[PDB]
């Protein structure tokens, strides 16, 4: 059972695809195991770069393929390197840039909490053939959080485990529990842009919506909300065009519907005040003057939308 | 006639292109057949990964090319693996991510029922040369439906069949019935986002559109519906920018046309009310009070879209 | 002069690029020619798939490169196959997906008539060396016309010709008339979508534009025409953002100009009526009642533009 | 010093990238030079296609690499062909699609004059080793300019020159004047689409903007210009979203700014007219009748833009 | 420790990705070192182009892989060349196009000062094996600044240094200090487009926003600011649709927020004017006359952003 030691170096995690639930990761893989002692030129370890690695394999060098389980497509592999030591040991070092998959929940945008995951597992060798001895991940990140889209929080989380597959080859003794490495990097979204450029003005839009009750005439009260209605649509447009596409409603999407709700509610109330009367122009002096009622009733509905 | 057993493992179905009628599928293919017994090291199966497979083929290993009939372009092949057994049997395992084609009807969007199809067929070997014995498809997906865009319903539809080509090679006896595996996975679109962020507020727009008749003056009644027209255009725009591009009208597209219609009808009625008179400002108390006539008359247009 | 038989199988024509005058074609090419008889294992036809073809070419197998004259870039080749018959004949079969170029006029969009073209020609062997004997094209298409963007007219038109190049190598006898196969597929755009979702609502806009004349006051008449102006711009935006990009104006584009024209023309009349007087407020009783003049005057200008 | 004759065939120039100053060219390069006499099969010239050229190079065929100096990235090479003559001469033929760079000034859009340039130069061989004897360029183009985006003007300008590099290897005699072929093709933009769908309606907007002075009331005069301002915003949006992205202002971009100014200037006067009084509402009968002042002052300021 | 001299030629820096913090660089690398003296054909230096370089590596030619540290993905390599001199020395010349990463601060857009960086490091050989002797970078650029998006300032900054890695093999002597070349190119953004087409009219919107106080009636004063609000919304959209996406607010983003604030302040003031009274109709003749108060009160808040 060959013991394989892994070391992952993470350079950059970028380009999150919200729709595809995807993120790109650039870095290096280092895999080490001990083989049969070799005769190296001179006696210091022998270096075999890119092209030449295949040539060594053709001569029977065992270099096991390690698969990125949760990779989308196949990674762009940069430089490959084999370091052959005379005492037997082998070090496979290669740089990669890959597109990775993971379950991502974006409901509480733009205050989402995400975790970037890497899953490594031998493609052909089961737990009894190839075994992951240990793994350390180096997240060589730091500083300038206010410049980056994501703020990495913890340090790299690591777990070597054994994955059992129920439907495999015509093999029955016990060859089915491949050993799998799982790396986890926690991150939080930089909410600064969405607060100041979306939440804030949306708030002012919704706030200024309530100012329709301070209008004197009914004709004024009603027609203005059509302009106000037209505003929320215009804002829904600007929102939807810039925010990331998802198959569900976010906090902001809820806020927009709530905006649509306030205006349509105002429309009903304004009409109600005017034509529900006991003479003709009896605009319910108090209901037309609900100028504080549903702004704070909106603060009640606002606190429940979070609940 | 070589009997081949196939097993498909579906990891991810994502990235639907509505216009090209395209969807992406990531997974593994496993194909197995029994060859002439080989003498493997020890007696345990011999493993051959990626690069080395080609070399073995040059030495006379028969590894049949299985074509994905309904693939767009050529799929990204990840790791390749040949498992050679001493008793003869051969197992081909490879990871793939491909863009596949299938007829997709998006008329009743966002309430689609779609089906993702895979069609496997040997590229050069007919039914009498190579025949598909059986296939099981493993959709190891489950849970968290409200996070994913599509909801997979059944397990997997499977069908091995024989395709006759009328125009083929220089063969006339019977080399023309290639065997095809056809895998079908049914899915329904997650309508949650589109209902709350598109359907609902559109309804309120159309709803509030009719409130233009509760205006007192003729000028108020008329001028306001222009703002209302401008509202539907703005909403039609917001719709088009976000929704999937199609070469036909959807339910949503139809609602928008209906929006244009309701406003245009009111325009006609409002002008009519004022100018259908025996003096000049005889605004027909019944027609200016079509405040219940065509709002629920629109519910007839709504039931006709359902019929 | 080697006689070559060609068969093109068209699977899907999609992805028309309006600006580049380009369309994507997925399908198979089959080329057959008769060489000197071979000794195949047994006597059974020999099959050579992908990788192995190059090995045969290195050993002196003549497989002429057949170039797609009008392809942009180089096509995505799927599976390749050499079928070598013992009587001599050789069959090259390969799947391809390519982006093809052709002159495309989109002026009378969305009512275009286009034709999808393929041009095959030997890359290195002239007519006296290699000549295209015959070609059949199989467009295994039919049905689902109102689900698809294009309606195919013919089945497939073909023309084998000899292309004379006037400026080539320092060769003078007669080596310059390469034989070319040209396949043509006629198609018509399904204008239904653009009619209901673009032509129609634009029409309602222009129509309701004319309703500016049923307004009483001058201030109403003029101020309303500014909201009307803003609506057409809103529509111009919505149109261009969704419709295909071209280097010229379409039928839809002209309607938009016509909308702008009607309103600016209306602006001129409305101002004219008020200030062209014999007192100050003598609004010309007939010119203010141009409520029918240019609605049918636009239908006159509209019907003349069709000429 | 090997005399090399080159012939460039241009099939298609498309896909201008305004920001990157890039354009795509599809075509063929043909290179001919005379080597030491060969003994060819039969005695007529030998043809070598794609794959086989590398094999010939491995056995000592000198095929010099010709670099596209102004290519961005590395070109899509189609078919390669070596034609080996017994009298010595060798003819290299290959099809290419490449993205080329050139300084492109788009200031006077959509009335650009552009020139598409190709620069060819040997990668490793200087003027005394390899020299370009002559070059002819064939633009096999013609007809239907009103169908294409760019109108090719000239035929093709040609220039073989000697390029001196001052910093190369530690080499000193005179090995620094690589011979370079420079192909230039002039073209003019088809302004039809931009004129009718952008210049004109923008023009009508700016013109009709001035109709703000024929309004009676101050409130009307002022409030209308807010709708007028909102229109230019809408138009700026529609323009910029469709127009090519640039790092400078175009003619059309200038038109838009001119619109903002016309409207803001109107706002200032309208406020000015009103509060510059001998009572409160004494609007200077001539300043309210600046209905002719700055419309023709706009044509005076407009012609200065030509200066 | 092999002394390697490097020379980078920068052709084009283009395509900045604001979110990914990425820029594309086209150019050449030249690497020179002295090997063991060779016997070259004739006696003049031997040239080895593209394909043949691998062949030399197989026969034992040491050609060290020099890795681009801050490269995203793997660069597109154009022509490769090995120049082998008889005295021993070897020169590697290769053209490259790569996407590079660097910390990029875009806060003060469109007035960014950016620096484009290249980082070279040997992939497999440490400081005691391979040492960077010296490096010169040639940015053969100059002139035509008003045409390009970025204005290159310096002549290019250099830093040859030694990077220590702390976590590698079970190696203890001193092999962990790879030598790294870092090239820096300073650049400034061409702000012209964003000033005239974004900064300028946005200011006019804000300026004209204040003109709401020159309105006489209360309803006019209040209702007009809703058109004004909708305009800033309209403008926020146009800004966002054209300007580059970032995870933080820029000056322009701030200008828009300043607008939303200015208008909301007016809404509150206008409402305040109307209802804070000692009679009923005391619309503060003085506070409605803040027509100069917060135009300069906005200039007080505005000048604070410079400090």
XYZ file of N, CA, C and O in Angstrom, chain B residues 19-22 54 57-59 62-74 101 103-107 122-125 129 165 167-171 178 218-219 222-223 226-227 229-230 233-234 236-238 240-241 245-250 253-254 256-257 260-261 264 267 271 274-275, chain C residues 9 12 14-15 24 26 28 32 45 47-52 55 76-81 83 85 89 91 93-95 97 138 140 144 146-149 190 192-194 196-198 200-201 203-205 207-209 211-212 214-216 220 223-224 227-228 230-231 234-235 237-238 241-242 291:
568
model
N -30.903 28.901 -26.863
C -30.895 29.100 -28.317
C -30.321 27.937 -29.124
O -30.877 27.558 -30.156
N -29.206 27.384 -28.663
C -28.554 26.297 -29.381
C -29.182 24.963 -29.030
O -28.902 23.947 -29.673
N -30.045 24.980 -28.015
C -30.642 23.754 -27.499
C -29.519 22.808 -27.057
O -29.299 21.743 -27.638
N -28.808 23.243 -26.018
C -27.543 22.662 -25.581
C -27.516 22.571 -24.049
O -28.117 23.398 -23.365
N -2.673 4.659 -25.652
C -2.336 4.827 -27.054
C -1.208 3.881 -27.459
O -1.268 3.248 -28.512
N -2.415 0.396 -27.847
C -3.223 0.250 -29.044
C -2.336 -0.014 -30.255
O -2.640 -0.879 -31.075
N -1.216 0.701 -30.331
C -0.217 0.480 -31.374
C 0.294 -0.948 -31.382
O 0.678 -1.477 -32.424
N 0.308 -1.566 -30.208
C 0.722 -2.953 -30.078
C -0.425 -3.935 -30.281
O -0.304 -5.115 -29.951
N -7.296 -3.816 -29.120
C -8.524 -3.323 -29.721
C -9.338 -2.547 -28.703
O -9.974 -3.128 -27.823
N -9.330 -1.230 -28.851
C -10.125 -0.366 -28.004
C -11.034 0.418 -28.929
O -10.594 1.331 -29.620
N -12.306 0.016 -28.991
C -13.283 0.606 -29.911
C -13.680 2.031 -29.544
O -13.947 2.328 -28.377
N -13.745 2.904 -30.542
C -14.178 4.274 -30.307
C -15.692 4.331 -30.198
O -16.403 3.997 -31.149
N -16.179 4.757 -29.038
C -17.611 4.937 -28.831
C -18.000 6.411 -28.970
O -17.608 7.237 -28.145
N -18.771 6.744 -30.004
C -19.111 8.143 -30.261
C -20.369 8.593 -29.532
O -21.356 7.866 -29.458
N -20.308 9.798 -28.978
C -21.478 10.451 -28.428
C -22.242 11.111 -29.574
O -21.871 12.191 -30.034
N -23.305 10.449 -30.028
C -24.079 10.886 -31.191
C -24.569 12.333 -31.088
O -24.432 13.106 -32.037
N -25.117 12.697 -29.931
C -25.729 14.016 -29.748
C -24.866 15.042 -29.023
O -25.378 15.988 -28.433
N -23.557 14.838 -29.065
C -22.602 15.809 -28.553
C -22.329 16.942 -29.548
O -22.268 16.724 -30.761
N -22.225 18.162 -29.030
C -21.878 19.314 -29.853
C -20.379 19.547 -29.817
O -19.835 19.933 -28.780
N -19.709 19.333 -30.945
C -18.263 19.421 -30.944
C -17.661 18.117 -30.463
O -18.198 17.038 -30.712
N -16.525 18.220 -29.785
C -15.890 17.058 -29.189
C -15.607 17.319 -27.705
O -15.050 18.358 -27.352
N -26.647 17.931 -27.402
C -27.780 18.524 -28.098
C -29.035 17.682 -27.886
O -28.969 16.451 -27.854
N -33.663 18.272 -28.583
C -34.814 19.129 -28.835
C -35.384 19.665 -27.523
O -35.786 18.902 -26.644
N -35.422 20.984 -27.396
C -35.927 21.601 -26.181
C -37.009 22.629 -26.484
O -36.790 23.590 -27.219
N -38.185 22.401 -25.919
C -39.312 23.301 -26.073
C -39.379 24.219 -24.862
O -39.546 23.762 -23.734
N -39.257 25.518 -25.098
C -39.275 26.490 -24.009
C -40.532 27.360 -24.021
O -40.556 28.421 -23.400
N -41.560 26.919 -24.742
C -42.786 27.697 -24.890
C -43.415 28.093 -23.554
O -43.747 29.259 -23.332
N -21.154 2.972 -31.075
C -19.812 2.695 -31.584
C -19.605 3.411 -32.918
O -20.502 3.413 -33.761
N -18.442 4.033 -33.086
C -18.165 4.846 -34.270
C -17.983 4.062 -35.565
O -18.353 4.537 -36.642
N -17.380 2.883 -35.478
C -17.066 2.143 -36.691
C -17.547 0.689 -36.677
O -17.639 0.057 -37.726
N -17.885 0.166 -35.503
C -18.287 -1.238 -35.408
C -19.797 -1.475 -35.271
O -20.404 -1.143 -34.257
N -20.488 -6.641 -35.422
C -19.116 -6.516 -34.939
C -19.082 -6.199 -33.434
O -18.440 -6.915 -32.663
N -28.930 2.633 -40.900
C -28.558 3.685 -41.827
C -28.756 3.153 -43.239
O -28.349 2.032 -43.551
N -27.751 4.674 -46.073
C -26.634 5.030 -46.928
C -25.336 4.949 -46.136
O -25.010 5.859 -45.370
N -24.604 3.854 -46.310
C -23.355 3.660 -45.582
C -22.182 3.274 -46.467
O -22.072 3.707 -47.616
N -21.312 2.440 -45.900
C -20.094 1.982 -46.551
C -20.444 1.124 -47.757
O -21.618 0.931 -48.074
N -19.426 0.594 -48.423
C -19.649 -0.297 -49.553
C -20.183 -1.670 -49.130
O -19.760 -2.700 -49.662
N -21.103 -1.674 -48.167
C -21.739 -2.903 -47.702
C -23.254 -2.978 -47.942
O -24.001 -2.057 -47.603
N -26.082 -0.381 -36.537
C -25.340 0.031 -35.340
C -26.195 0.070 -34.078
O -27.318 0.576 -34.101
N -60.263 64.146 -17.575
C -59.972 63.428 -18.807
C -58.482 63.474 -19.111
O -57.896 62.468 -19.506
N -57.874 64.642 -18.921
C -56.443 64.805 -19.156
C -55.616 63.942 -18.216
O -54.619 63.343 -18.624
N -55.957 60.296 -19.339
C -55.237 59.998 -20.569
C -53.720 60.100 -20.460
O -53.004 59.179 -20.856
N -53.232 61.220 -19.937
C -51.790 61.439 -19.841
C -51.088 60.380 -18.995
O -49.972 59.965 -19.309
N -49.837 57.119 -20.537
C -48.604 57.251 -21.309
C -47.405 56.927 -20.428
O -46.421 56.335 -20.875
N -47.508 57.337 -19.167
C -46.525 57.009 -18.147
C -46.609 55.505 -17.930
O -45.604 54.831 -17.697
N -47.659 53.323 -20.219
C -47.107 52.703 -21.420
C -45.597 52.619 -21.262
O -44.973 51.592 -21.537
N -45.030 53.737 -20.821
C -43.604 53.879 -20.590
C -43.162 52.910 -19.496
O -42.015 52.477 -19.460
N -42.958 49.305 -21.232
C -41.755 49.269 -22.061
C -40.516 49.049 -21.192
O -39.673 48.204 -21.499
N -40.426 49.804 -20.102
C -39.329 49.670 -19.149
C -39.302 48.264 -18.562
O -38.232 47.699 -18.328
N -40.794 45.550 -20.046
C -40.504 44.656 -21.158
C -38.995 44.541 -21.350
O -38.471 43.459 -21.617
N -38.311 45.670 -21.192
C -36.860 45.756 -21.324
C -36.170 44.962 -20.218
O -35.307 44.126 -20.491
N -36.557 45.239 -18.976
C -36.023 44.547 -17.803
C -36.174 43.030 -17.950
O -35.277 42.269 -17.584
N -36.486 41.271 -20.966
C -35.666 40.791 -22.074
C -34.174 40.689 -21.770
O -33.502 39.758 -22.220
N -33.663 41.635 -20.997
C -32.246 41.644 -20.672
C -31.836 40.454 -19.802
O -30.723 39.944 -19.918
N -32.740 34.055 -24.136
C -33.089 34.389 -25.503
C -33.675 33.162 -26.186
O -33.165 32.051 -26.050
N -34.781 33.372 -26.884
C -35.451 32.304 -27.606
C -35.898 32.800 -28.972
O -35.982 34.004 -29.206
N -36.180 31.870 -29.888
C -36.727 32.295 -31.174
C -38.250 32.263 -31.176
O -38.860 32.281 -32.241
N -38.859 32.209 -29.997
C -40.317 32.242 -29.912
C -40.832 32.907 -28.628
O -40.071 33.129 -27.683
N -42.127 33.221 -28.605
C -42.734 33.902 -27.467
C -43.076 32.942 -26.344
O -43.654 31.881 -26.578
N -42.765 33.347 -25.119
C -43.088 32.549 -23.943
C -44.389 33.022 -23.289
O -45.096 33.875 -23.831
N -43.500 36.443 -22.273
C -43.506 37.313 -23.443
C -44.926 37.712 -23.787
O -45.175 38.851 -24.176
N -45.841 36.756 -23.630
C -47.271 36.951 -23.872
C -47.926 37.920 -22.883
O -48.788 38.722 -23.258
N -46.471 40.368 -21.474
C -46.024 41.689 -21.885
C -46.855 42.254 -23.034
O -47.222 43.432 -23.022
N -47.131 41.420 -24.032
C -47.988 41.824 -25.141
C -49.346 42.221 -24.588
O -49.946 43.206 -25.023
N -49.242 45.679 -23.186
C -49.377 46.647 -24.266
C -50.839 46.784 -24.689
O -51.304 47.887 -24.998
N -51.553 45.662 -24.718
C -52.947 45.654 -25.125
C -53.892 46.360 -24.169
O -54.708 47.184 -24.591
N -53.340 50.115 -24.340
C -53.851 50.632 -25.604
C -55.383 50.645 -25.629
O -55.995 51.556 -26.189
N -56.562 53.587 -23.507
C -56.339 54.788 -24.304
C -57.527 55.027 -25.219
O -58.058 56.139 -25.295
N -60.341 58.099 -24.569
C -60.657 59.063 -25.622
C -62.129 58.960 -25.996
O -62.810 59.973 -26.187
N -64.824 60.467 -23.410
C -64.868 61.922 -23.465
C -65.553 62.431 -24.736
O -66.343 63.376 -24.684
N -65.248 61.807 -25.872
C -65.735 62.295 -27.164
C -67.000 61.607 -27.690
O -67.570 62.043 -28.692
N -22.919 14.680 -44.357
C -24.108 14.480 -43.539
C -24.277 15.677 -42.617
O -23.429 15.910 -41.770
N -26.752 19.541 -37.753
C -27.378 20.722 -37.190
C -26.732 21.959 -37.770
O -25.509 22.062 -37.826
N -26.749 25.822 -36.809
C -27.103 26.720 -35.728
C -26.097 27.863 -35.615
O -25.120 27.920 -36.366
N -26.341 28.750 -34.653
C -25.427 29.832 -34.338
C -25.026 30.723 -35.501
O -23.843 30.862 -35.820
N -22.664 27.926 -37.719
C -21.998 26.706 -37.278
C -22.685 25.482 -37.886
O -23.911 25.383 -37.851
N -22.546 21.200 -37.845
C -22.042 19.941 -37.294
C -22.456 18.792 -38.211
O -23.607 18.724 -38.649
N -20.806 15.017 -40.680
C -19.791 14.027 -41.032
C -19.396 14.164 -42.496
O -20.243 14.438 -43.340
N -14.391 8.522 -50.342
C -14.006 7.202 -50.809
C -13.244 7.317 -52.122
O -13.589 8.113 -52.992
N -12.707 -6.227 -44.344
C -12.285 -4.829 -44.481
C -11.540 -4.397 -43.233
O -11.941 -4.769 -42.131
N -10.478 -1.762 -40.409
C -10.859 -0.488 -39.806
C -9.692 0.138 -39.040
O -9.019 -0.530 -38.256
N -9.426 1.411 -39.310
C -8.390 2.142 -38.598
C -9.006 3.391 -37.988
O -9.412 4.295 -38.714
N -9.093 3.441 -36.662
C -9.679 4.601 -35.993
C -8.621 5.620 -35.558
O -7.435 5.307 -35.498
N -9.095 6.819 -35.228
C -8.299 8.022 -34.952
C -6.775 7.950 -34.981
O -6.162 8.101 -36.037
N -6.184 7.745 -33.807
C -4.734 7.736 -33.618
C -3.992 6.938 -34.676
O -2.997 7.394 -35.240
N -4.501 5.746 -34.948
C -3.851 4.807 -35.849
C -3.775 5.248 -37.314
O -2.998 4.696 -38.088
N -0.381 6.656 -38.171
C 0.584 5.567 -38.328
C 0.577 5.005 -39.739
O 1.621 4.655 -40.280
N -13.600 21.650 -35.697
C -13.391 20.711 -34.602
C -13.656 19.320 -35.132
O -14.790 18.970 -35.456
N -12.602 18.525 -35.225
C -12.743 17.171 -35.716
C -12.995 16.198 -34.577
O -12.275 16.200 -33.583
N -14.056 15.408 -34.712
C -14.374 14.349 -33.771
C -13.630 13.083 -34.155
O -12.419 13.121 -34.357
N -14.353 11.971 -34.292
C -13.736 10.685 -34.631
C -13.337 10.541 -36.095
O -14.108 10.874 -36.986
N -12.144 10.001 -36.332
C -11.632 9.776 -37.681
C -11.630 8.280 -37.905
O -11.539 7.518 -36.957
N -11.758 7.849 -39.149
C -11.758 6.424 -39.440
C -11.260 6.135 -40.842
O -11.702 6.756 -41.799
N -11.329 3.120 -43.493
C -11.797 1.790 -43.822
C -11.132 1.354 -45.114
O -11.429 1.874 -46.189
N -10.456 -1.395 -47.893
C -10.993 -2.618 -48.474
C -9.914 -3.385 -49.229
O -9.018 -2.776 -49.818
N -10.204 -0.094 -52.533
C -10.897 1.130 -52.157
C -10.679 1.543 -50.694
O -10.518 0.703 -49.803
N -11.991 4.332 -47.560
C -13.025 5.251 -47.095
C -12.609 6.062 -45.872
O -12.347 5.506 -44.804
N -13.802 8.536 -43.074
C -15.016 8.980 -42.414
C -14.657 9.752 -41.144
O -13.888 9.276 -40.310
N -15.178 10.965 -41.018
C -14.869 11.808 -39.867
C -16.007 12.752 -39.526
O -16.652 13.298 -40.419
N -16.245 12.952 -38.234
C -17.200 13.964 -37.810
C -16.500 15.308 -37.648
O -15.359 15.370 -37.199
N -17.182 19.714 -36.738
C -18.028 20.854 -36.394
C -17.283 22.117 -36.743
O -16.210 22.368 -36.213
N -26.764 14.501 -47.128
C -27.913 14.025 -46.371
C -28.261 14.957 -45.220
O -27.611 14.941 -44.174
N -30.589 15.018 -42.727
C -31.546 14.162 -42.044
C -32.521 14.969 -41.183
O -32.928 14.528 -40.112
N -40.818 20.111 -36.766
C -40.566 21.107 -35.714
C -40.148 22.460 -36.268
O -39.112 23.003 -35.886
N -41.920 25.491 -36.151
C -42.224 26.616 -35.268
C -41.518 26.551 -33.902
O -41.749 27.394 -33.037
N -40.676 25.535 -33.715
C -39.827 25.421 -32.524
C -38.431 25.902 -32.901
O -37.686 26.441 -32.076
N -38.097 25.725 -34.175
C -36.793 26.122 -34.680
C -36.824 27.491 -35.342
O -37.847 27.930 -35.877
N -35.665 28.139 -35.300
C -35.463 29.489 -35.798
C -35.574 29.568 -37.323
O -36.091 30.542 -37.871
N -38.200 32.332 -39.492
C -39.543 32.337 -38.937
C -39.804 33.678 -38.257
O -39.366 33.897 -37.128
N -42.361 35.021 -37.003
C -43.453 35.047 -36.042
C -43.075 35.772 -34.755
O -43.810 36.650 -34.297
N -41.926 35.418 -34.186
C -41.497 35.993 -32.914
C -41.325 37.497 -32.974
O -41.798 38.220 -32.096
N -40.645 37.965 -34.013
C -40.359 39.387 -34.158
C -41.622 40.170 -34.501
O -41.729 41.358 -34.206
N -44.834 39.399 -33.349
C -45.629 39.571 -32.135
C -44.938 40.336 -31.016
O -45.575 41.107 -30.299
N -43.639 40.127 -30.863
C -42.920 40.740 -29.758
C -42.165 42.014 -30.100
O -41.707 42.712 -29.201
N -42.025 42.321 -31.386
C -41.330 43.546 -31.774
C -42.130 44.450 -32.705
O -42.335 45.621 -32.398
N -45.397 44.333 -33.569
C -46.700 44.651 -32.964
C -46.645 45.728 -31.880
O -47.324 46.747 -31.999
N -45.859 45.510 -30.812
C -45.954 46.536 -29.768
C -45.458 47.890 -30.242
O -45.978 48.909 -29.788
N -45.974 49.045 -33.148
C -47.137 49.575 -33.830
C -48.105 50.262 -32.887
O -48.623 51.330 -33.207
N -48.363 49.637 -31.738
C -49.260 50.207 -30.733
C -48.709 51.530 -30.207
O -49.461 52.464 -29.925
N -47.389 51.590 -30.074
C -46.694 52.809 -29.674
C -46.936 53.960 -30.651
O -47.348 55.044 -30.249
N -49.238 54.167 -32.911
C -50.677 54.425 -32.968
C -51.080 55.339 -31.828
O -51.672 56.395 -32.042
N -50.730 54.933 -30.613
C -51.051 55.704 -29.421
C -50.323 57.042 -29.412
O -50.708 57.962 -28.695
N -49.250 57.133 -30.191
C -48.575 58.405 -30.398
C -49.528 59.414 -31.018
O -49.506 60.590 -30.666
N -52.609 59.622 -30.661
C -53.687 59.942 -29.734
C -53.398 61.231 -28.970
O -54.176 61.650 -28.113
N -52.267 61.851 -29.291
C -51.868 63.111 -28.686
C -52.794 64.240 -29.137
O -52.914 65.270 -28.470
N -56.141 64.094 -29.538
C -57.416 64.136 -28.832
C -57.329 64.878 -27.490
O -58.318 64.987 -26.763
N -56.140 65.390 -27.180
C -55.935 66.226 -26.001
C -56.429 67.645 -26.249
O -56.297 68.171 -27.354
N -56.994 68.259 -25.214
C -57.618 69.569 -25.353
C -56.622 70.737 -25.378
O -56.484 71.422 -26.391
N -50.959 70.530 -22.750
C -51.150 69.088 -22.679
C -50.600 68.416 -23.932
O -49.829 67.462 -23.850
N -46.528 68.897 -23.995
C -45.835 68.191 -22.914
C -45.970 66.674 -23.037
O -45.027 65.940 -22.743
N -47.136 66.210 -23.478
C -47.374 64.779 -23.657
C -46.499 64.198 -24.757
O -46.062 63.051 -24.678
N -43.186 62.901 -23.392
C -43.255 61.578 -22.780
C -43.283 60.536 -23.889
O -42.701 59.454 -23.775
N -43.954 60.890 -24.977
C -44.092 60.017 -26.129
C -42.739 59.839 -26.804
O -42.378 58.738 -27.218
N -39.842 60.121 -25.317
C -39.048 59.330 -24.383
C -39.383 57.845 -24.468
O -38.528 56.996 -24.222
N -40.625 57.531 -24.817
C -41.039 56.137 -24.971
C -40.372 55.443 -26.169
O -39.905 54.309 -26.062
N -36.909 54.704 -25.340
C -36.939 53.539 -24.460
C -37.091 52.259 -25.282
O -36.510 51.222 -24.955
N -37.882 52.343 -26.350
C -38.105 51.216 -27.250
C -36.925 50.954 -28.175
O -36.610 49.805 -28.474
N -33.921 51.454 -27.430
C -32.959 50.809 -26.551
C -33.270 49.322 -26.440
O -32.418 48.471 -26.710
N -34.509 49.029 -26.058
C -35.005 47.664 -25.898
C -34.830 46.816 -27.165
O -34.424 45.654 -27.095
N -30.862 46.293 -28.045
C -30.239 45.450 -27.037
C -30.506 43.958 -27.259
O -29.665 43.113 -26.936
N -31.669 43.638 -27.821
C -32.072 42.246 -28.025
C -31.887 41.748 -29.467
O -31.414 40.635 -29.692
N -56.430 64.682 -36.477
C -56.568 63.439 -35.739
C -56.737 62.271 -36.703
O -56.625 61.109 -36.318
